[model samples]
Target: QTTSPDILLGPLFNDVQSAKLFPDQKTFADAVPKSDPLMILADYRMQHDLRHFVEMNFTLPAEGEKYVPPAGQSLREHIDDLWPVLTRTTDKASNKWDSLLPLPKPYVVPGGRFREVYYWDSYFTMLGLAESDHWDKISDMVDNFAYEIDTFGHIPNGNRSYYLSRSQPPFFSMMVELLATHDSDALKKYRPQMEKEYAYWMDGVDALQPGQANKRVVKLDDGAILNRYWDDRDTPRPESWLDDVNTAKSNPNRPATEIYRDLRSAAASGWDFSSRWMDDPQKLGTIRTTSIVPVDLNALMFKMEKLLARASQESGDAASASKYEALATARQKAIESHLWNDKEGWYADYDLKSKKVRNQLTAAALFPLYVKAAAQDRADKVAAATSSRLLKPGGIATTTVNSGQQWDAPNGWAPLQWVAAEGLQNYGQEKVSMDVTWRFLKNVQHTYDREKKLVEKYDVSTTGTGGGEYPLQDGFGWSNGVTLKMLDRVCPKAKPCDSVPENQP
Candidate 1:
């Protein structure tokens, strides 16, 4: 897929005035049937010709299409009814849009505009699937992620050709662990693919000379190599072409390529516009995601390496296991020395340019505990700080900064709440974990009670509807998953379990 629609298709598709014809660049791109762009451009002379082409070839589901919940059903039953609508399948040969990589089985999408299988979203989605006793679907989702690793060097942000330049958070390792619950052979089956993903993250490590940092791997002053979010392509994202173009135009003094890299790197972090990655917390244009070594990224990488080590040992590869375990040990130490803030009692992304930790205290701080990388003392400090600063009546905010960004304060996301709560529980902070769990469940339940629908994110401060670039979305995959998981965590056998057999279709 082309990185920028304007560069590949020129003014034909993504002109400043094209929004007058199509809703957005994505709609125009999605509507144009899969065909040789060169041939189509050759046939089209003007905007009218392109419009005709789109009108003829457009086949994607209309934006107006929405899921209707069953009449008078409880919120729980409504979520159960949404499974089939959210489940999707595609073959390498028969997919509608370009995917570049193949997903070998049916996977649950996050719903709404997110019709494709997303990278990190699947992990949270599986939490609810496990609650629903849909172990087979969860297993298929894991297989799909493994297949992405096998086909693409890394999992893309979503299963879209345009998302090839970047990936979302590295949650495939976590997904593998989730699958191992019922399937003992999961680690063995996915070991090779997992290793491939590890290599993909550390691709430039061998070539990194003394002070050089390449792609995802950063070489610290102490010769410790840490991971950071990065993207191979340095161009405006095709889906958000207009928004990027407008932002670039506003900051004409800066290089467009640098702006694009910042944008793509933020996408890799999965907190697309948070203050955590911004050089200047006030300005989105000052985002230097590539310059910051994220605590969450390194913590997750440590988990990946450790998981690989465990898997290698299980497969009787002691040498490989020892090597990975050593790498994880070194990474754990680096995270402690660099990312952990002793004064603040929290973890933060390390700024490479400034040689200091980023000041934003986002929910990302919980990641060390999530991966069980932090020492017990550090975990306790983190738990205390999190409860004091991050927790609200609704849930924990993504960050303390209210920057009108979706991943900022006031907006509580389902994934982060689950991460914080589970990480707290992992560190033996059960009281605080349950506090977060109940607050988030109440937020979801109250919202559903009022609106009769689950939403993507909630305004935890007000315990009301979420605010973002778009209206609050429904058919929420992560919300349902995290809600179910936390509910089960607090009361394991209190709620009746889904008794369907694992083999049920």
Candidate 2:
């Protein structure tokens, strides 16, 4: 395992906001020798401000030089042009960030503060790319993830050294399927990668005794296994060091280590901070992400199992196909039995400790429907709850709570919107799905009209401005992806050749 540079640099790492300035901790660590770690740290701290080093290495071209589409081009065409600005290719000498392992091929990144390829974000980005003439680029991104799984035990949250300790929701299988749509051979070629990812999630299954659990896999009292969002590191995220440290200080009585774990676990869920993961819905300090088995995570894993099963059958491996089919079936049963809340009329994460559903209703509830995991009766209930409770005028609120966190109410995210819209559409709730889709499109179109840029998130309830620690970001990856996807659905292209499949890849 790699150690964070902050630990070795000690006071010097504190002096410089190492997390903010350095893209990779290992890069900074590599620049210094172990024989004289203190001296190197002192020299770098005294000779230069790390922020300036970051600017020189990380800053993109000026606005004047950015890609500009021809005057009459449509929004979708403009998005096609912007891809060049967002594409990155790293090499051994590249100063982009310190990667735990080198990426031998190019990958697209979510723009602004995120200059790296994120796990789940790429899935949605690929959603739009599948419709474009960029199948090769999409293949590059998929290969990068497979490379990560081959090198690391699992894919990290993003392609950064700091992200190695955690992964976002499992979406690699979805990416693979998206590619397989273009080329049938993709399923057999990527079968090993699919099996490897499945193995990563189910690492401790064989070791599980009665009521035992470990890492990503949880063994239930009924001898059934499910998945949860987890982080290998129990420390503050290096990229958000100051925020995590400050949050820890605010909760003086609670163990700082626990706070760090919760924070990391929330990151793994891609929600960062939400009432869904908090022990007390009102308290940010009450987050216990590791204790809850998220419906979305397991739903995603179910998809992975199914994809692998399909791939195995395509490759003439009946034994592997049957095994994965059984895994997916068991997971679906486990999800329905454990995660559903009959009284609440929606699915919520199951708390392993309390042996009850976590009552907070968030957009995550829609995921069971996304994978077609919910039966018709349950899907109908979830659809009603989403329209009545989660939908806002601009779009869908991420959650009902207004916690001032970016992932909470008034703040709508692109990926969640995609999940809810498609999930509802899958279950024969076309009218409801289209309604939510149009509303979210209106939000994006309205915001873009005002700001002339696509943003990372939206304030779906009132003003379209998003709320969080930082200012709203532009050159957003998933926003562009979802917009392109939903727009095609709402208004199909005049030519049949231009139209992409909405129901599937």
lDDT of each: 0.78, 0.76
Model 2 spans > 4 angstroms off? 1-3, 18-39, 42-73, 93-101, 462-474, 495-505
Q: Mind giving the per-residue lDDT tens digits that candidate 1 earns over 1-505?
A: 3343445466665652346565565665444345665655665654345445655543543564365656666656777777767887765633333433457898887775564678887889998898788999998888888777877778888877778778878888878877887788788888888998888899889888756799889888888899989988887777777777666676777898888899888988888888777656677777778998999899999999999999999999999999999999999999999898888888888888888876678899999999999999999998998889999988888899888777888889999999899789998999888778878877877777667777788989856465432343346889888877766654447564331111211
> Least lDDT summed over 10 consecutive residues: which range in candidate 1?
496-505
Q: How far is candidate 2 from the true structure (C-alpha RMSD, Å)?
A: 4.7
How high a TM-score does candidate 1 get? 0.92
Please tell me which predicted candidate would have the highest TM-score against the true structure: 1
TM-score of each: 0.92, 0.88
